[PDB]
Design a protein around this ligand. Structure first.
Ligand SMILES: Nc1ncnc2c1ncn2[C@@H]1O[C@H](COP(=O)(O)OP(=O)(O)NP(=O)(O)O)[C@@H](O)[C@H]1O
Ligand SMILES: CCCCCCCCCCCCCC(=O)O
Ligand SMILES: [Mg+2]
Length: 603
């Protein structure tokens, strides 16, 4: 019984109490051992699309557990609890067996990517120099790429490379449960590092978010209690496992023994119908869940055209997040798939970040998905005033409520004081899901994780937190709470501020998209760069798939006029490029800061 199992850690007041000895792996094994009679239950289906039709690999409860313990036992022949180990593989069952197997051995995994995928050499080099793992877990498909990545080092300095699907299951029988130290010094197991999450999309040197057993276990409990899950369920995901959103979701589902169906982002992008087909109702189905970034809604709405017989009525939650969720994308999806059983009320925009482990807010009322319209001028002055659709209005999507126990406060970053609901500020979070810091980065850790709330409102969203706490996490994200609902406006650092007015890229990007059918839907990056004595607005946009460069001139003129009229700024530059030329993350989403850097290095 899952719901009781997860409730054992809550108290009457809704507070979480974790025993000092609990770890992520200990929780996983506790649930597995309680799942008497569950060993033969189907738990994971992996789609290999080396061929176009694809071949499924299936694993039941027992097989997953055995693979995990085989990995752990092998690690215990060559390493100690606390050692770091990089995971360098494509999305695959081995990726998960390696990550969780490291946890079982008390090692600290570092989820990374297949190094043969382009665009990671600098990143991987920096991560390896930062975390310095002596061991790499990989699979047979990726092992050559891994061996080559390290071929410029002295052989004696290369990490040991372990290919998980070369390990026999006879290893599992020698796995040993790590025992806690008795010392004096001793950090409790629950407070030890669980894994290191290096995020992507930034041009700066990678920083390792240190997630502890406490961090993750707390967020797993917060997620479970807030998501109002219908069990049993299956979760469909193609998210990259080296992304915060991908790996925690897969681990959440695996630790609870629920059903998980996985492919790689490239499989979705090349044939989005594969994803819609996976959400289609199957005979055994009870509840189906999915988690995607915003752009995927537009891609599927256009390119996963539905057939007679498609039945999406089993989809109980379509979580959308990791980037601004747009009205345009939500409605295109709802309109395309609503006639085939997709309940619009089950679209659930949500917000989080690695520094909070995974999830900060998600809809916890029936009022979702929320779309609200705000006066653009007031918004540019940090005030949210609800207006009627389509009269100088900015459409923003509600991402729900904080997942307790946890506080979410809107804070003036200049004065570090709470602001009233309806006032735009920086989101600050407080709770035991927060990460411990950035690995070996004391000042960056202090800036992001060790903030003090200098002042609060009479009715404070910080209620329950000691007034002197120095543990507020400043997200770097701007937003506002209106009528109890959180809205994300943009990243603080990437605000477009021109002549004393704040402009939000997502707002500008809608104007650009809407300004001409020459532009590929949702394929716009708007950002500011420093000019002579002011900030310049730069706009990059791909022309749609069927369009010729001869239409660029017209689209540019139309984009310029539309943006000037709606926002009162004449773009300094409007560049139109070919489809897929705008740089994107491994998940497929536009990587704005990476594009901005590339533009500056071309001037
Ligand atoms: N629903 C959302 N709406 C708008 N933005 C979101 C949403 N969900 C996540 N984000 C943004 O994604 C961020 C969290 O992404 P994360 O996976 O932690 O790495 P990252 O911030 O993109 N890269 P880095 O600069 O290295 O930290 C938040 O801080 C938001 O900026
Ligand atoms: C069974 C599925 C329910 C799980 C819902 C929690 C997932 C929410 C994802 C939030 C994404 C933002 C994280 C990020 O961008 O780093
Ligand atoms: Mg960040």
């Amino acid at each position: 019984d899952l719901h009781k199992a997860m409730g054992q850690f809550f108290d009457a007041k809704g507070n979480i109490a974790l025993p000092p000895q609990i770890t992520l792996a200990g929780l996983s094994e506790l649930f597995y051992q309680s799942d008497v009679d569950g060993g033969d239950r189907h738990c994971m289906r992996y789609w290999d699309y080396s061929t176009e039709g694809g071949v499924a690999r299936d694993y039941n409860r027992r097989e997953i557990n055995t693979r995990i313990k085989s990995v752990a036992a092998r690690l215990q022949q060559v390493a100690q609890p606390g050692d770091r180990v990089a995971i360098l593989a494509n999305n695959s069952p081995e990726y998960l067996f390696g990550f969780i197997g490291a946890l079982y051995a008390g090692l600290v995994p570092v989820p990374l990517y297949d190094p043969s995928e382009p665009g990671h050499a600098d990143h991987l080099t920096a991560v390896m120099a930062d975390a310095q793992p002596a061991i790499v877990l990989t699979n047979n498909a990726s092992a050559a790429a891994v061996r080559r990545f390290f071929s410029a080092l002295p052989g004696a300095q290369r990490p040991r490379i372990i290919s998980i699907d070369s390990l026999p299951d006879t290893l599992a029988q020698s796995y040993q449960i790590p025992t806690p130290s008795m010392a004096a010094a001793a950090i409790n197991p629950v407070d030890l590092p669980a894994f290191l999450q290096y995020t992507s999309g930034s041009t700066r040197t990678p920083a390792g978010v240190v997630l502890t057993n406490r961090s993750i276990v707390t967020n797993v409990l917060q997620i479970f209690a807030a998501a109002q899950l219908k069990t049993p369920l299956r979760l469909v995901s193609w998210l990259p496992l080296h992304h915060d959103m991908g790996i925690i979701l897969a681990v959440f589902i695996t630790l609870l023994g629920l059903e998980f169906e996985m492919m790689s982002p490239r499989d979705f992008i090349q044939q989005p119908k594969r994803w819609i087909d996976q959400l289609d109702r199957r005979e055994g189905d009870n509840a189906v869940y999915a988690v995607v970034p915003n752009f995927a809604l537009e891609l599927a709405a256009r390119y996963a055209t539905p057939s007679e017989g498609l039945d999406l009525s089993a989809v109980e939650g379509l979580i959308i997040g990791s980037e601004p969720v747009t009205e345009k994308a939500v409605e295109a999806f709802a309109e395309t798939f609503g006639p085939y059983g997709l309940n619009r009320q089950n679209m659930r925009p949500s917000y989080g970040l690695a520094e909070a482990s995974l999830l900060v807010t998600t809809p916890q009322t029936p009022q979702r998905p929320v779309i609200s319209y705000f006066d653009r001028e007031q918004l540019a002055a940090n005030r949210a005033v609800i207006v009627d659709k389509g009269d100088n209005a900015v459409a923003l999507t509600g991402v729900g409520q904080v997942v307790r126990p946890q506080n979410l406060v809107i804070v003036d970053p200049e004065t570090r004081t709470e602001v009233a609901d309806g006032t735009i500020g920086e989101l600050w979070a407080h709770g035991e899901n927060m990460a411990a810091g950035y690995l070996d980065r004391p000042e960056d850790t202090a800036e992001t994780f060790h903030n003090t709330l200098a002042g609060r409102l009479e009715n404070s969203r910080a209620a329950g937190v000691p007034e002197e706490s120095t543990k507020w996490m400043a997200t770097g994200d701007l937003g506002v709470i209106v009528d109890g609902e959180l809205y994300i406006t943009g990243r603080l650092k990437d605000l477009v501020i021109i002549a004393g007015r704040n402009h939000y890229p997502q707002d500008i990007e809608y104007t650009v998209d809407h300004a001409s059918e020459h532009i590929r839907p949702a394929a716009v990056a708007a950002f500011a760069i420093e000019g002579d004595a002011v900030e310049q607005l730069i706009i990059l946009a791909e022309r749609d798939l069927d369009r010729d460069p001869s239409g660029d001139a017209e689209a540019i003129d139309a984009i310029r006029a539309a943006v000037t009229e709606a926002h009162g700024v004449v773009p300094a530059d409007i560049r139109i490029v070919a489809p897929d030329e705008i740089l994107r993350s491994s998940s497929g989403k536009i990587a704005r800061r990476v594009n901005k850097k590339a533009y500056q290095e071309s001037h």
